[PDB]
Amino acid sequence: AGMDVRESISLQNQVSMNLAKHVITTVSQNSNVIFSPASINVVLSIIAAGSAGATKDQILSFLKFSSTDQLNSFSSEIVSAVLADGSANGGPKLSVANGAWIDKSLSFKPSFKQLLEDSYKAASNQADFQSKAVEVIAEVNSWAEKETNGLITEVLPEGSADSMTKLIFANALYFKGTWNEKFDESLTQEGEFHLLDGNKVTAPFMTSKKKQYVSAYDGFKVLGLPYLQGQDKRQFSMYFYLPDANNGLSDLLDKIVSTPGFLDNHIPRRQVKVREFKIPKFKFSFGFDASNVLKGLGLTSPFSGEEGLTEMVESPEMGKNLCVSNIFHKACIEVNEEGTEAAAASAGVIKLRGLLMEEDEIDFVADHPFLLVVTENITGVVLFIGQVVDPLH
Numbered sequence: 001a002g003m004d005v006r007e008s009i010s011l012q013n014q015v016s017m018n019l020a021k022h023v024i025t026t027v028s029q030n031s032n033v034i035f036s037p038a039s040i041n042v043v044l045s046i047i048a049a050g051s052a053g054a055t056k057d058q059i060l061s062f063l064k065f066s067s068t069d070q071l072n073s074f075s076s077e078i079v080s081a082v083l084a085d086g087s088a089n090g091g092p093k094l095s096v097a098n099g100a101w102i103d104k105s106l107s108f109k110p111s112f113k114q115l116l117e118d119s120y121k122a123a124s125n126q127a128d129f130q131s132k133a134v135e136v137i138a139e140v141n142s143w144a145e146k147e148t149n150g151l152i153t154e155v156l157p158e159g160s161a162d163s164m165t166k167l168i169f170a171n172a173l174y175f176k177g178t179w180n181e182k183f184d185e186s187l188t189q190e191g192e193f194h195l196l197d198g199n200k201v202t203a204p205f206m207t208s209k210k211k212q213y214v215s216a217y218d219g220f221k222v223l224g225l226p227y228l229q230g231q232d233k234r235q236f237s238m239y240f241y242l243p244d245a246n247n248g249l250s251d252l253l254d255k256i257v258s259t260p261g262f263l264d265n266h267i268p269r270r271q272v273k274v275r276e277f278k279i280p281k282f283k284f285s286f287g288f289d290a291s292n293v294l295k296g297l298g299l300t301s302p303f304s305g306e307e308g309l310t311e312m313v314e315s316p317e318m319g320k321n322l323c324v325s326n327i328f329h330k331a332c333i334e335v336n337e338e339g340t341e342a343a344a345a346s347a348g349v350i351k352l353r354g355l356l357m358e359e360d361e362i363d364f365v366a367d368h369p370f371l372l373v374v375t376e377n378i379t380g381v382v383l384f385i386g387q388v389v390d391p392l393h
Contacts, residue, residue: 010260012063014263016385030196034331034372035331039172039173040327040329041063044302045068045072051302054301055301059302062297062299078379081234083173086230092177093176095173096121098147099125099140099143099147101170103167104126105130106167107313109313123143137156140156141155144330148172148174156170161325167324180343181210181339181340182340183339193392194367195390196247196369205280205366206278206281206336206337208277210271212277213226213268214274223268224239224268234377236374238372240279242366243368246368246369263375263382272359273361274362279366287328303324305322333386366388370387372386
């Protein structure tokens, strides 16, 4: 067809929430999740580019773009700019690891290797999966560690690739940002978090008396926490989606998944007065092989010998029945008090106005499971989706 990048992104983000739903289905009740839909979609764009026929088409439709050219450009023009490190300019720190390895019984078309290098800044290599799978795993891990300056350490789990492994992708996204408004660490206090299994646990909750970006909706609330920008043009924020009910998470995610444009429509844009305001600290990483959940969402062709990836390698006999073995992804997230030390003080106009008006106050107390979304606000691109079901792990 033909379509605006804004609507592409809006469609993608909805599919991404359903992907998040399916990932959550594969972990235990109390397992935290964090992953980067953008990075996943970067891999799928790479795969589309090395494919054709019903396979190219199936991925094209999954990703909401009409051609491989559209994908390629959206990646290099938009996604990479969004995924670029911002620390040099005072914005958040981001680091990306992006690569493909194929059993050395094969070889990529030189042309494919250049596309990966140019539109994607992605490595491509051969490996001896057939006889040295254990070494290849360590090699890929060392490589990812090198690409992320030691930040991400183990994209492939032990025993994840073997003598049958033919084609893998390894992808990682590290992000660390300073809040636009620090929390006073002196105010952090222990408190009860209510687990989905019915039990409670004691955990550090941050608090504040400053005004917050919070909106209430039917059955849930949303909090936005902007990241310090510096000279970075991008504007990152983290959003918290908090069901009213302690066990409401699953239903809230069902609502999100079934409502087109949900994310575009639940962005709190006004700082309002909070009465009770509690945010649990948390810090964790999360990794998975995307191949199975994607098959679950019906994106089956890249992983089936049926069609294959005939535009990726050189031997048409090898390219026939060649498919993706694994898509290894790793992400990590952290929430603490750290905010900018360089803020200009506020004039206090709105505070003064409050001495003359009756401003309505609101609670946002995240003492139970909530969803997480990290987005770049200018493009609307989503860096991370996650769930915090247990702050202590």
